[PDB]
Design a protein that fits this description.
The complex is a heterodimer of chains A (67) and B (21). With 67 residues, chain A is of the alpha+beta class. Chain A has three helices and two strands. In chain A, a hairpin with a 4-residue loop joins strand 1 and strand 2. Chain A is globular, with a radius of gyration of 12 Å. With 21 residues, chain B is mainly α. Chain B has one helix and no strands. Classes of the chains: A alpha+beta (67), B mainly alpha (21). Chains A and B meet through helix 2 and helix 3 of A and helix 1 of B. The PDB classes it as transcription.
């Protein structure tokens, strides 16, 4: 019984900066039996509206949030 | 390489936020 919510995604960014690839990997195909497109579509609609900030960490782009 | 199609799976997500970025 696993569900995806905006609060859950933001929680990770609020605690530690992460990348889109890392976020998707969390529920890419671990347990949730959701289609690859569906998984991205759900997080995309939520993340896309997130309009967060980008930071250069280890020569890479990461997502960070400051409530 | 060992991976390819899987990488694109995440690219779609980044493509969205890429706008507001």
């Amino acid at each position: 019984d696993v569900q995806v919510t905006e609060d859950a995604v933001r929680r990770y960014l609020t605690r530690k900066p992460m990348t889109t690839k890392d976020l998707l990997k969390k529920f890419q195909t671990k347990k949730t039996g959701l289609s690859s497109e569906q998984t991205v579509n759900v997080l995309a609609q939520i993340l896309k509206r997130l309009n967060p900030e980008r930071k250069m960490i280890n020569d890479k782009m990461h997502f960070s949030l400051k409530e | 390489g060992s991976s390819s199609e899987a990488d694109e799976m995440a690219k779609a997500l980044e493509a969205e936020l890429n706008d507001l970025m």
